[model samples]
Target: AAPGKNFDLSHWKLQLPDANTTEISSANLGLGYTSQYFYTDTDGAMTFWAPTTGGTTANSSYPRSELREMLDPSNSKVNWGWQGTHTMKLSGKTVQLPSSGKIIVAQIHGIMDDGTNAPPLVKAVFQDGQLDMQVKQNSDGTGSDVHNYFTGIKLGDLYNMEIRVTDGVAYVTMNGDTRSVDFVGKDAGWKNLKYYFKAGNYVQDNTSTGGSAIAKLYSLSVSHSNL
Candidate 1:
């Protein structure tokens, strides 16, 4: 189930420590991505890899509360021209939802391209679950592409992108509407990919690529209800 209450979170309460920094023992967790960071060689930056093996430093912080560059890490000077360069992070809390109850997943958030590599970065965290990302644009700025998995189809417009889960289904919404998705069963093969809860850029670094302004970590909290 959802949290006992729906709280308003500022864009800077996402500060989270490393995995081993603390003991995490929450019941349920929900993560949202409102912004992304550059994660380069800045004072608050966590180390990252990129082109030239030694990867150059980037301005991890961005001027806006949303968006981040989608630069290719290995090249550091080109555009991945996709989505999710900067993803979201969890509160490092862990909760074991109904062990036998059908697994349900609810997800929600927003993303924009703005035609600039510095618009916003998006990534999500799911307690013990997994996180995935796609591309987005034209919701409020520039770029003419879109790829969302909700509504059970592909539509471009890059607007309305949030999902919520309960029982064994997910309520997907973006902007101001909602939809539902069923969770058939658990995934034993969902381990073939890497997971990112923090903002990490995947854009191909451009020679003129404009990076983020600052790295942000807002209050990443997780509250759950026994189903």
Candidate 2:
């Protein structure tokens, strides 16, 4: 079965690790799309594979077989604001890591209203045996990112994560334990940016010396509501 047949992918588009940095539209995804970089595993999990040699999209140095959230399936430009409650829940594991042993599994990326990009607000990264939540202190690239680690998650171990944003706070929950940060408190500029969610295998390494990374998703979902 195709991944979309088993998962709720109505609001996401896929970015593949190809020479053109191709993107699979939401419409195609729902119609049972599958590729070498993104496919369904024997265990019925949605899988992502990204090689260090793969192509990268604009402004990104690394490569990914990832998903980008789209509130309106027909328009990537339509996004949400900070005033509402937004949430993403994922159950997955890093089945393989690059030679660097690091990969980003999920993210809340910021975008400008004028169709440009801003820094990501938060990223859930897996490195070897540890899971770290990287939260940006500022909307613009001014301060360092805050890193918070979750305990007991190792490579290939199944884990659950919930990333939620309400008001100015970004909450990250792993295996039922949660931590939060107030982005607006750190920098008022955060309120000025629009946001979207992303998930899958985003290998942090770009060098040929590093190999590839693979991630498997048993379940994934996103929700948005008025506060």
Candidate 3:
């Protein structure tokens, strides 16, 4: 379906108007911070957090309902040890919208002059019902596109994410470059998770310290199809 109207970014907040919004039950909205989570804490220190509701015990395997955000540091040091040069930043609340026509958009801007490199982002997971989309980027600039992970993704750009039963697909454009993924099948795991946006590898907890990762999120828009 065509976007009936252009999204008024100013009107979109993490908790926007939606009668169908669902409140996540967990204490940790899955927004975790690494010792080196500098990019987001840009001024340095994790700024966005509702508070870890449950016990944040160290773990080898991260649970989705728990804090699924982490930074991969060398030797699994587990802390903000590796975030390169960055500046101050702010983030938003974790939200699951009623539909995906408007997705939870996340943004973080900084001087990409570190030269050391941008954080090593490997995957992005989005899902609704049984349908879901996951994008993985090779740390190295290789394959059909050197745009490892989020290279070509224009900073501060909004992308529409949809995972309906009939048209299960994800679409977004950056710098006039369009990329999309057709969700082949709906997975139960995707259906079970809530609408969330977390940096530092959403798949697992901080394995490496200073593999610091942070991004500010202003809003999240999720919607259900059958409704």
Candidate 4:
């Protein structure tokens, strides 16, 4: 449970509409930073989903949903932690395992200077009825083509995920097994390297006309510990 008020999303911003950059009907787009995307139940559990009830005509793309930390990284610790459990509805035209496309359920981003979005240090994507972790090689400049470090997640199953970053190294643990990668490469100073967290559906297949996904977020939290 993300407690009261502060957890009302007063510290987050929706990064959608622009990520797609194509014209979309706001009526059906369902893009916003309110309960529409992040809302809690009577029992305090959080549910997350991208609205699949909209579309963009011929040759345009739009993200179903996305919420990013509004905090400037410079004022925050580059090293942070994330822990949460997700239940997949895994249905609908825009969501599901290996359906019409790939869905990025959740991820953390390394935003470099000049607004270049570095590869996600850690991300869980759904494919073929299994949730797999896509761990980017901190040194590998390649985009979303990296290998999967974990797999075989069942639908509707509760998944606990965690990540820790220290001194340019990112350590990730899912369920219980752990994996890590160092981000300090030829680049010096490490000042240009900054990061933040992002969550929600980032559908990978644009070839299809359109689609959507709905996910349940039981709990989510981020913490910082310096070495």
Candidate 5:
């Protein structure tokens, strides 16, 4: 039971975060020979993994396994949400203290790509054995995370995470605590914001050898209200 599968992601697709020189349009998770990194377990669970090391900061060098939920590029208002039961842990092999990589487990992105910038409306990152949600506040023709909620996390722990955006405001929930934020001011490009959502392993550092991380996900979903 995947979120995108349960909801209307029929038009959704996946692509490299900062690089789109190539395109991936498919029915499955785009894990074919041309695209393979995600897999489905016997229980219908979804799993994503990426090497902890390797890959440069270059636009197309970073390794990622993301699912994109595309929105109609229109002016009409849209309310949506993406969520699932997520579990995180070290890769094939566990390591000592100071795991040298950062993993972005999920994100609710509003991509208004003027060919210059496209930032996530909200992002969930796993760092230092903890989970935090980064809420971006658009400003000065750009955006930045104005808030960070430190949601306690644990390895192998299955927790519920959700990001819901309604009428330009975002409602995020982790565990049982929920928070709301407004990112509709100052050149936020709300009217033109091309909304989408993604999930999986987005490793941020490539220094540690034998480095890798895995996301065990189940019952994922993405939905939207009338425009």
Candidate 6:
């Protein structure tokens, strides 16, 4: 089965690990698209494979076989603001890690109103036996990201995570344990940016010796609402 057959990917576009930095449109994804980098595993999971030697996006040094949210399938510019409630829930596991032992499984990325890129707002990173939520304290892409760790998660262990932003607060929950931070309170600049969600295997290393990272997703979903 293709990944689309196993997952609801109607609202997301795929970024592949090709030199061209190719992106599969949401329409194609919904039509049962499958590739070496994105496919359905034998366990009926949506799988992602990204090698350290794979192509990188413009601003990042790493590579990924990931999905980027699309509120409007035809327009990447269509995104949500921080004034409403936005949420993403994922049930997945990292089956293999690069030599660096790090991979980002999910993210909340920021974008300028004019379609320019801003820093990612949050990242759900898996490192060996731990899961870490790296949240940006500032929207301007400065300063060190604040890291919060979750216990008991290990390689190949199925786990659940929820990344939710309501009003100005960002909450990250892993296996029922939740932690939150005031994103806009820390940096009012964040209010000016638009946002979207991303998921899959984002291998953190770019070295030739770092092999590849693999991740499998049993389920994934996103929602945005106004209260």
Each prediction's TM-score versus the true structure? 0.25, 0.98, 0.29, 0.64, 0.69, 0.98
- Candidate 6 lDDT at 29 equals 86
lDDT of 1 by residue, 142-203 (tens): 54322233332211122223433344333444445553433212321111211122232222
**In model 3, which regions exceed 4 Å deviation?**
1-122, 125-166, 172-177, 185-205
The numbered model that scores best in lDDT is: 6
TM-score of predicted structure 1: 0.25
Q: Write the per-residue lDDT of candidate 4 for residues 173-205, one digit (tens) a residue.
A: 657666665544323334355667665556555
Per-candidate RMSD, Å = 17.8, 0.9, 17.8, 7.5, 6.7, 0.8
RMSD of 4: 7.5
lDDT of 6 by residue, 42-132 (tens): 8999999988999999999999999999998899999999988999999999999999999999999999998899999999999878999
lDDT for each residue of candidate 3 in 117-168, tens digit (9 for 90 to 100): 2222212332221112233222233322112132423323333332212232
Error of 3 at 83 (Å): 40
Model 5, position 58: C-alpha lDDT score? 38
Q: If both were scored by lDDT, which would come out higher, candidate 1 or candidate 3? A: 1
Residue 144 alpha-carbon offset, candidate 4, angstroms: 6.8
**lDDT over C-alpha atoms for residue 6 of model 5:** 33
In lDDT terms, how accurate is model 2? 0.91
Which 10 consecutive residues of model 6 have the lowest summed lDDT?
139-148
lDDT per residue (tens digit) for residues 82-188 in model 2: 87799999999999898988899999999998759889999999976789999999888688988889978898899999999998799998899899999988999
Query: Sorted on lDDT, highest at the top, how do the candidates line up?
Result: 6, 2, 5, 4, 1, 3
From the highest TM-score down, the ranking of the candidates is 6, 2, 5, 4, 3, 1
lDDT at residue 169 of model 3 (Cα atoms):
30
Candidate 5 per-residue lDDT over residues 1-227, each given as its tens digit: 43345333354454432233233454543233123345554554466556644343334345565655544422212323322212211121112112554667778765444423355667787664567788777633454676666545666666677777666666777765677776664344564655567766666655546456666566556655544
| Runs in model 4 lying further than 4 Å from the true structure | 1-10, 17-38, 41-44, 51-62, 72-98, 114-116, 138-146, 185-191, 207-210
Whole-model lDDT values for every prediction:
0.25, 0.91, 0.24, 0.48, 0.53, 0.92
